[PDB]
Design a protein around this ligand. Structure first.
Ligand SMILES: Nc1ncnc2c1ncn2[C@@H]1O[C@H](COP(=O)(O)OP(=O)(O)OP(=O)(O)O)[C@@H](O)[C@H]1O
Ligand SMILES: Nc1nc2c(ncn2[C@@H]2O[C@H](COP(=O)(O)OP(=O)(O)O)[C@@H](O)[C@H]2O)c(=O)[nH]1
Ligand SMILES: [K+]
Ligand SMILES: [Mg+2]
Ligand SMILES: [Mg+2]
Ligand SMILES: [Mg+2]
Ligand SMILES: [Mg+2]
Ligand SMILES: [Mg+2]
Ligand SMILES: [Mg+2]
Lengths: 51, 101, 349, 208, 80
RNA sequence: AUGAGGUGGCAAGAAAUGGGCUACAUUUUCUACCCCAGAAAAACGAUAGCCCUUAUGAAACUUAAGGGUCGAAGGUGGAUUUAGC
């Protein structure tokens, strides 16, 4: 898959840049993407749609 | 004093969705991962289903803000095609001109 | 056109002039490996004339000044597409065949790494795959090329074919070749045994080996063969490719590893890739290093004029304006002196 | 048309421009002087001054083109010419010197003569006298004759009777047959002539 | 690992091992055991060869680089 | 209550017909490349059917994508008819 040195360096870079450190699958990255953005309902363009 | 009852219903749906957005976000986050136990995910599923129907964001319909038209609405201006054409033709929308090329 | 037809005497004096191959030599030395278009031209003209060019001359010089005591040297003919790598390699193959070398000629190593209907599993090593059709075809061609030494060469081991059938030390290599050809299931094993025997016996002075491999870059590249599980297969899993890789090492002596790069027919390589590293990759360059790269370039004006004159003498350029200076200039511009482009254009002009 | 009516099609011919000035009649000199002040359409990407250019073969390639695949059409044309030349060379080599003098090896000449043989002299057109159209025989102008010959060649090659036979070989074989005055294309020309003769009695129905 | 490097280092590399083994085989064929790893690698020919190989591996590969490598390898292998 | 709100539900095919997509292949199919190759070739041919997975969603047998599986009708189409300088 990946060299051990490259994998450890990638994990270190992830820790330094604040990304997800633990190994996680695309299914569970949905949590990160959900919480990294406002809900569509919370967005002003939605709840402030009508004058 | 909205244009019609459909617009009124949509306004209520938007208000309730805004009110329940955070709770739905958290519960859906619980449900949308393979990490937590599936029993916990199932109870989260029943909770999110037990939340009121109108809180569901998908039920929000983007209607024209001036004639409650449910289709042919330009999201950028929130106006149906008819109203947008009216304003653009009369020249009351800045920078919008007939396209010829 | 030169009166000289011996592939050992021609030198810089014959540069840019033609060199004939007799029908017998063409049917014996070259039952495979000649370019398809050159084969069509040979059939049409009834003659096989190769222009003598600096790449072939230099490689012949090296092979004549070679010291068989030293480990076999790797020569790699590289150049743009259609510049003449394959035909220079064929010229050197003819020279060595006339000098009585044993020619181990792989006509296109690319064919072994793509478009294979029959991909069985090797019985000698279950982790490797067999290519019986290609193995049998190449064994037939090898027998045709080197039948003369085939009975004079003996094996030096015991080679089991089935749980009961086997070949014994002291048997002719013709027995191995015949077993491989006749029993198509043992073709890959016969190829491997032949390669091993030739490599080992070249060190004993029994003869001089010329391992002439076209499209050598295919061995250490990728492959377009998929396992039954739709899984890609790297070249090493192929028994033929692995054995040829072993052959490509200079650990032995008593011969020369001549090879030619060929982007045409390669897999996962861009059209304009022609340089040694660009075509071989890190693995291929590591394996071949050290090696002597020989550049095959487009025709110089003298060679271009010679080839045009050859076609005109054959009456191939049937267009009424071809003999004119203007027609010659147009041909030169269109082909940019590229041998393949010039030949293709003259094929219909 | 992005070209205004004032635009004239270019005349791409080296000899025309290299012609000596003294050899020009007054009208020719006037034409040149007029062209000196006329807008000219840019040369189309199909024709050049190349001495190997052949308008007939270019038009055949265009007619053979399918969906803008000029590369493939040109490839088929050159493959056909190469196949014809190879077959003629094979016949020339396998033939005795007595008939080698007559055996033709120029593929361009073979193609031109094959199309010329395929050209129909008379066609059938609907002509109307009194309110009824009839397939009256009529002479075919040169453009129509050449087009019909080329189209018949292409369609006969495209027929599905020849299976797993590539267009190069199909067209080379048909062109050779036409050159020797045989084959389905010449048969179609003869069928057209036979139908015209059978309806000969209706010639007067023509008014022009 | 070697794969985890962006700079090509000739020392203790496959190219170095291959050229060293080739030189050892050549000297063994000459039957003169006046050789050693340091003795072989100290010669200027090996310096030029490693320079050319490093140039090919790191710098952009072009005709000039290939010609330099060819000359170095010819000199090393005593074929000209 | 011909007004308003809530839950659930239909939105299918006997069959015809209009438009479009895919094809019937060799100027074709698969692969590499983006045009100098190798294989395929009675196979070509579904974007349909069935099973699984994934994406969105509170809700997917009924939406989309992917994979698996199957390899179907068809073999350039009658009068008639559409478009294009
Ligand atoms: N030395 C030569 N003498 C005669 N013809 C030659 C020579 N070199 C090339 N040709 C012509 O070019 C064609 C063969 O090209 P060749 O196979 O040598 O090119 P290549 O670059 O090795 O091929 P590839 O495109 O696979 O790399 C034939 O038409 C042949 O007549
Ligand atoms: N069937 C068979 N093949 C042999 C035999 N010896 C060598 N070969 C061939 O050569 C290969 C083995 O080469 P060898 O020198 O043993 O090296 P190895 O492949 O690393 O084991 C086999 O895969 C065969 O293709 C033998 O006795 N029987
Ligand atoms: K139709
Ligand atoms: Mg909606
Ligand atoms: Mg080649
Ligand atoms: Mg009501
Ligand atoms: Mg399906
Ligand atoms: Mg779900
Ligand atoms: Mg099928």
């Amino acid at each position: 898959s990946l060299s051990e040195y490259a994998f450890r360096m990638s994990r270190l870079s992830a820790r330094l840049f604040g990304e997800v450190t633990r190994p996680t699958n695309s299914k569970s990255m949905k949590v990160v993407k959900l919480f990294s953005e406002l809900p569509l309902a919370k967005k002003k363009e939605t709840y402030d749609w009508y004058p | 004093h909205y244009v019609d009852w459909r617009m009124w219903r949509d306004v209520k749906r938007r208000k309730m969705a805004y009110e329940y957005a955070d709770e739905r976000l958290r519960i859906n986050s619980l449900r949308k991962n393979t990490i937590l136990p599936k029993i916990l995910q199932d109870v989260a599923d029943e909770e999110i289903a037990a939340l009121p129907r109108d809180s569901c964001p998908v039920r929000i319909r983007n209607r024209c803000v001036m004639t409650s038209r449910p289709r042919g609405v330009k999201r950028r201006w929130r106006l149906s095609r008819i109203v947008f054409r009216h304003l653009a033709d009369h020249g009351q929308l800045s920078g919008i001109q007939r396209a010829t090329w | 056109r030169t009166n000289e037809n011996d592939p050992a005497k021609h030198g810089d004096q014959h540069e840019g002039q033609h060199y004939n191959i007799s029908p017998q030599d063409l049917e014996t030395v070259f039952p495979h490996g000649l370019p398809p278009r050159f084969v069509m031209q040979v059939k049409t003209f009834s003659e096989a004339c190769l222009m003598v060019r600096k790449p072939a001359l230099e490689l012949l010089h090296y092979l004549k000044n070679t010291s068989f005591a030293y480990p076999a040297i790797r020569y790699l003919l590289y150049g743009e597409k259609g510049t003449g790598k394959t035909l220079s390699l064929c010229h050197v193959i003819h020279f060595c065949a006339k000098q009585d070398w044993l020619i181990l000629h792989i006509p296109d190593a690319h064919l072994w790494v793509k478009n294979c209907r029959d991909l069985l599993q090797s019985s000698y090593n279950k982790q490797r795959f067999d290519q019986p059709l290609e193995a049998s075809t190449w064994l037939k061609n090898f027998k045709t090329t080197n039948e003369r030494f085939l009975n004079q060469i003996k094996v030096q081991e015991k080679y089991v074919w089935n749980k009961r059938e086997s070949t014994e030390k002291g048997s002719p290599l013709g027995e191995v070749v015949e077993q491989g050809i006749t029993r198509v299931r043992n073709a890959t094993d016969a190829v491997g045994i032949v390669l091993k025997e030739l490599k080992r016996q070249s060190s004993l002075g029994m003869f001089h080996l010329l391992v002439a491999v076209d499209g050598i870059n295919a061995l250490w590249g990728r492959t377009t063969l998929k396992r039954e599980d739709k899984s890609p297969i790297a070249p090493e899993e192929l028994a033929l490719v692995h054995n040829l890789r072993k052959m490509m090492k200079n650990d032995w002596h008593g011969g020369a590893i001549v090879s030619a790069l060929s982007q045409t027919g390669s897999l996962f390589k861009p059209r304009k890739a022609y340089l040694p590293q660009e075509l071989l990759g890190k693995e291929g360059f590591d394996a071949l290093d050290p090696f002597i790269p020989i550049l095959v370039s487009n025709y110089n004006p003298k060679e271009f004029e010679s080839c045009i004159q050859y076609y005109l003498e054959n009456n191939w350029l049937q267009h009424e304006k071809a003999p004119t200076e203007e027609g010659k200039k147009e041909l030169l511009f269109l082909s940019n002196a590229n041998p393949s482009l010039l030949e293709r254009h003259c094929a219909y002009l | 048309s992005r070209y205004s009516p004032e635009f004239k099609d270019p005349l791409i011919d080296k000899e025309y421009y290299r012609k000596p000035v003294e050899e020009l009649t007054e009208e020719e000199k006037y034409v040149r002087e007029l062209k000196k002040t006329q807008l000219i359409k840019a040369a189309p990407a199909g024709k050049t001054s190349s001495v190997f250019e052949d308008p007939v073969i270019s038009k055949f390639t265009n007619m053979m083109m399918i969906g803008g695949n000029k590369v493939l059409a040109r490839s088929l044309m050159i493959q056909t010419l190469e196949a014809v030349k190879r077959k003629q060379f094979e016949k020339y080599h396998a033939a005795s010197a007595e008939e080698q003098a007559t055996i033709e090896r120029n593929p361009y000449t073979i193609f031109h003569q094959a199309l010329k043989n395929c050209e129909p002299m008379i066609g059938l057109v609907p002509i109307l006298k009194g309110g009824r159209f009839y397939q009256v025989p009529v002479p075919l102008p040169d453009r129509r004759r050449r087009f019909l010959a080329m189209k018949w060649m292409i369609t006969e090659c495209r027929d599905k009777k020849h299976q797993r036979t590539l267009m190069p070989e199909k067209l080379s074989h048909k062109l050779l047959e036409a050159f020797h005055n045989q084959g389905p294309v010449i048969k179609r020309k003869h069928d057209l002539h036979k139908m015209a003769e059978a309806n000969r009695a209706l010639a007067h129905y023509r008014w022009w | 690992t070697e794969a985890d490097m962006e700079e090509y280092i000739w020392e203790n590399s496959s190219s170095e091992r291959n050229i060293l083994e080739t030189l050892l085989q050549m000297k063994a064929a000459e039957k003169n055991m006046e050789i050693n790893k340091e003795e072989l690698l100290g010669t200027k020919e090996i310096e030029e060869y490693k320079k050319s190989v490093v140039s090919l591996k790191n710098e952009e590969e072009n005709e000039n680089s290939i010609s330099q490598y060819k000359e170095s390898v010819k000199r090393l292998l005593n074929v000209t």
